Write a protein that binds this DNA or RNA. Sequence first.
RNA 1: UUAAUAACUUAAU
Lengths: 370, 386
Amino acid sequence: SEFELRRQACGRSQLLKSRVDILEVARQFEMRINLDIVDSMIASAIENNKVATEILPFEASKLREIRKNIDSGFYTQEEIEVIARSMLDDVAELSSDYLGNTVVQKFFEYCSDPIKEAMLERIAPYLAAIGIHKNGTWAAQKIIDVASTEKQMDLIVKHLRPYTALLYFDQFGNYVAQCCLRFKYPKNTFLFEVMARHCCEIGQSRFGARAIRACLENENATFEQQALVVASIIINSHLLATNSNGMLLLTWLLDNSFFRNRHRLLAIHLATHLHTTCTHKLASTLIFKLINNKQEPESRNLLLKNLFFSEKDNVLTYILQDQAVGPSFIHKVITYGREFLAQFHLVIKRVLINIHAQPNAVYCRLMEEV
Amino acid sequence: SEFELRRQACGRSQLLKSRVDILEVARQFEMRINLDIVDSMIASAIENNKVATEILPPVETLRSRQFEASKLREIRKNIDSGFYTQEEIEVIARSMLDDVAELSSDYLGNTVVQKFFEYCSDPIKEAMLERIAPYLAAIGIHKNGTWAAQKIIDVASTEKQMDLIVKHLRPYTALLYFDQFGNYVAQCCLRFKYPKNTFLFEVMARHCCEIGQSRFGARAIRACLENENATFEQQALVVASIIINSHLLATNSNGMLLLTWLLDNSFFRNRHRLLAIHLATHLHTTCTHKLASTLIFKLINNKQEPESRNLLLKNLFFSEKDNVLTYILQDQAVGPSFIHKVITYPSIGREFLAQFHLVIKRVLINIHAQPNAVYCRLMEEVGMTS
RNA sequence: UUAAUAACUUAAU
Ligand SMILES: [Mg+2]
């Protein structure tokens, strides 16, 4: 699957490793986030290990008349329910039918809850498969959108949870996932558990990253749910910054977010990954945004210490030994003080000597600046 | 509105005042013109006074736009695939009569409404048109809807359809000519032929000033006059209206395009003579305007039209108490430069040249014009200084 | 000789 490929390129979940670091970041937001709620979600995130590999899956005239008579008000609610109960053996197959999907929709709009629960009991094991179907997705979102009882939501949550990651990857399934935000806490929690645990894999997909943004901006996400996923975004920022989709989440985090200390906490974490981020074409752009920001001095200060005044200049050496990104980054960073500027000038000159750096197109500007 | 500004810079219509002068210009056009038809057009032009100030779109309702988009995509997809009967199309169209007016301006709906008029039979077209006609003008000036409005007009096959279009477009006709898209919507009605397309020429004659001064209306007038469905009476009505508005058209490049078209047309006889006769009574504004004076200068320099340059020069220099020349030489940026250019042109003579020199000398003295950069060159030409 | 198809910025029958 696409999940298998990104799971291989992400390693073990940062939520598994840094359960205590995530709890601290959520605490260190200074937003009064209840840690017991956050930890229990990390608990249920680790508890629920069922993760799916793939998603596994009455002629035209007769269906049209059913839909025609329902739209015409020609039916009683009890008359619709007799029809529905007589099609339970087929209602799952119909949910993906180009005509059946419109009928199953009408069935859920008008039947009473016990019949909706009877239909859903036959559909639930296929809801994720219907959810990614071009036709079926209209029925699956309608089913979730009209889920009114507790028995209905639990059935949807139970049979969607193993496929929640795979849904975020899908052009239609990620909207099906978002439909579950209606359930509110605690039923919609499974969405944020999956987003936090697989923030690396989901964040690197074209749809999942955009669906994460949507979930975090949703009015039914509690602060704790937001804090859990955002903290996961932060401790994965060194991985998300390496591709455009992950960068979208980080861009969203810096700009369109109300989280206090997000800039500082993001910089603090990225300071231990300066060699890889500042040598990557896209990640270096973010590292510069964190330093160039004048209103975040603690970030720029900690980022500059780890950048130039390192254990043995190994951080600065790695960056300047890179060809396509490294030296351009360091030259920029400095060319935007005067006493402080010469102090950085001193450290750059030492590394370029030990690099044996030639003054070709890579080192023209930087060698002149120091 | 933007219409209010064009009429304020035009004044009241020259068609109302000079109803008999237009009839005069129509005669001296030669041609096979039935003169009585022209006057009855000026009559219908003045009777029909219901003119709209603005163009209002159909009120927008609330739609689940993505369920609506999928529906329209499939309708267009199945029509293009021939999977639909003409009856199946008409069933769908009849179910959307409450919606065709608002859909006509939609990015997708406009393509579907087009197909509906291409494929439905005439009763269903008339049924759709009865819902769309009061907004056709609005649809007509929409960047999307104009494709649907022009289609509806181009496929108007019955008399009931043309009359509906003419009925519900006439109040907005002037507004359509002003619009970058609506002016093509108005031209689509030229297909209707005489006498149904006459409303286009009535509006062009009454509002010749406002329309002829606009980038799109002036070019639309030129297109209508060159259209194969414009009778000689319709051409003469509008061209004569252009002549009696020449002093206003000559003040911008769009109206000047109409006058340059008329002169280079060579189909209307006595165009140069009739144009100069009218422009001789408006020498104050033309000879002081940057662009209009260019035309007046061309009308005199033309040696092959001697009668025109004689009437122009008599009214230029020999006016009551010198008020025409006074106004021109009182102007700074255009006036004096024009008179000097008229003098220093070897086509006047010498008996008349001294007569012109006398009056200009008298005006500049009675103006108390100083010999600065404006009047230095001209003052030496008549005496004054050296 | 003035022409011209919307927005969205992850949607879709
Ligand atoms: Mg798009």
